């Protein structure tokens, strides 16, 4: 649970994708959305809407009142199943929306924390867990340095000594 949690607000200035990073550098400050996680989720939610619509089977029915006044018992029998199927479909659809609406919003909570742990596991003691979903580097890190946090190609032992020394300064 990260959306309603430590990352309280959603970055209203991010349009590239759904989940992304924000870097504060002396050289610049900007947003860069993680396309790998967003495209997996954009395809993921569309897979759910399509399966709800495509798995439905329709086989042509002609629904009309064809019984006369001396056949009202059969007329009520057709009413029972017409009204019975409206009750089955209305209830199943309404709850299907509610159940899958939750599983969508929680699918976004999990994808955020998994990406938060993707950075947290990547750089371990080379930064400090601030608590906003943000990490402050113990060392210096420029614009090309932050491909690696996004890509996943971040070398911890390169800047480790800079983190081990700038930490004992107390």
């Amino acid at each position: 649970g990260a959306i309603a949690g430590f990352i309280e607000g959603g970055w209203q200035g991010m349009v590239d994708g759904w989940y992304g990073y924000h870097h504060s550098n002396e050289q610049g400050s900007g947003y860069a959305a993680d396309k790998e996680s967003t495209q997996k989720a954009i395809d993921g939610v569309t897979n759910k809407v399509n399966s709800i619509i495509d798995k439905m089977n329709t086989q042509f029915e002609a629904v009309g009142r064809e019984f006369n006044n001396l056949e009202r018992r059969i007329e009520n029998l057709n009413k029972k199943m017409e009204d019975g199927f409206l009750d089955v479909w209305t209830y199943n659809a309404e709850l299907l929306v509610l159940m899958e609406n939750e599983r969508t919003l929680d699918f976004h909570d999990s994808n955020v924390k998994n990406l938060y742990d993707k950075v947290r596991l990547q750089l371990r003691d080379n930064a400090k867990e601030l608590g906003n979903g943000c990490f402050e580097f113990y060392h210096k890190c420029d614009n090309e340095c932050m491909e690696s946090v996004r890509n996943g190609t971040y070398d911890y032992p390169q800047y480790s000594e800079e983190a081990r020394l700038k930490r004992e300064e107390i």
């Binding site: 959306i3 309603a4 990352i7 607000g9 959603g10 970055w11 209203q12 991010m14 759904w18 989940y19 992304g20 990073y21 924000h22 870097h23 504060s24 550098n25 959305a33 939610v45 759910k48 809407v49 709800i52 619509i53 439905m56 329709t58 042509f60 029915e61 002609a62 629904v63 009309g64 009142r65 064809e66 006369n68 017409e82 199927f85 409206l86 479909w89 209305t90 659809a93 309404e94 709850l95 929306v97 509610l98 159940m99 899958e100 609406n101 939750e102 969508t104 919003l105 976004h108 955020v112 990406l115 950075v119 930064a127 979903g133 943000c134 990490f135 402050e136 580097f137 890190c141 946090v149």
Partner: protein
């Protein structure tokens, strides 16, 4: 230097509901409940519907002088209350089964089988054509000629390749006096023959209420004459005989539709007495009485999923 992780957010107002949380604002949402219709009748798979503007199926099937050609239709539409049913009052035996069989027809063609010249002929003011009284066009009213009513024996044989639908009727006069005036013999019989059908109809002389100024009655019947089968008539003198038949080919079934709307050159997969539906969606809420491949009817107003994440603007 710092790195922050976050999620999308936009100026969105669309709301969805969660089984645990109500009124949740959302980035992007999609609706799956069809609420749209175009308000005009259309075809089904490109096949037109047989539409009767002011006539019932019986009034159009018989030759009602007030009723006004189509070789094929997918379904039938008739108004809530047609004003041109049977001009001369009466009944139609197995009328609902006959309508359901004619709901969807592959081929339909009127055929003359036994003409008027071979059959004298009777008329009533309950069926006006042009000020002057007329009668049903597709059938003949047999009244006595030269004051003596003899026996009629006429057999038509279906020689066409399809099944054909024969219609005929019997007349129930008001009292015993009107019968002798029209049909000389006091006791009357009508026998119809077929490899399937065996019946013998006797008129019912009974005092009744005036309907369109007519206390008499006329009750109609029908069968389907198999391709090489023949139908045989033998009447004492209460006969309302067929002059025209209908070659039919039966390949599909639909229902009879009730709506006041009319035709527009459109096409659709699902039909509704309020207007057609063009939907890939799984549900709708337009009308219960539908014809065609349709979404499931649902008693609701909103079925909105959450395609995007929850938003706080």
């Amino acid at each position: 230097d710092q790195i922050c992780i976050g999620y999308h957010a936009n100026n969105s107002t669309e709301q969805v509901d969660t089984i645990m949380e109500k009124n949740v604002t959302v980035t992007h949402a999609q609706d799956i409940l069809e609420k749209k219709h175009n308000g005009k009748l259309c075809d089904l798979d490109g096949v037109k519907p047989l539409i009767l503007r002011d006539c019932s199926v019986a009034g159009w099937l018989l030759g009602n002088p007030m009723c006004d050609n189509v070789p094929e239709w997918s379904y039938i539409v008739e108004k809530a209350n047609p004003v041109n049913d049977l001009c001369y009052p009466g009944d139609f035996n197995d009328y609902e089964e006959l309508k359901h069989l004619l709901s969807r027809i592959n081929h339909f063609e009127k055929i003359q089988i036994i003409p008027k010249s071979s059959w004298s002929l009777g008329v009533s003011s309950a069926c006006p054509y042009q000020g002057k009284s007329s009668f049903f066009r597709n059938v003949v009213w047999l009244i006595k000629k030269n004051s003596t009513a003899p026996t009629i024996k006429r057999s038509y044989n279906n020689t066409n390749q399809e099944d054909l639908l024969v219609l005929w009727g019997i007349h129930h006069p008001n009292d015993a006096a009107e019968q002798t005036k029209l049909y000389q013999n006091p006791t009357t019989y009508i026998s119809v023959g077929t490899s399937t059908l065996n019946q013998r109809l006797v008129p019912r002389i009974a005092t009744r209420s005036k309907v369109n100024g007519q206390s008499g009655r006329m009750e109609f019947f029908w069968t389907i004459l198999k391709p090489n089968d023949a139908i045989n008539f033998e009447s004492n003198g209460n006969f309302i005989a067929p002059e025209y038949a209908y070659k039919i080919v039966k390949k599909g079934d639909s229902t009879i539709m009730k709506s006041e709307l009319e035709y527009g050159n459109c096409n659709t997969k699902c039909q509704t007495p309020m207007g057609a539906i063009n939907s890939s969606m799984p549900f709708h809420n337009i009308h219960p009485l539908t014809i065609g491949e349709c979404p499931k009817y649902v008693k609701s107003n909103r079925l909105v999923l959450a395609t995007g994440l929850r938003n706080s603007p």
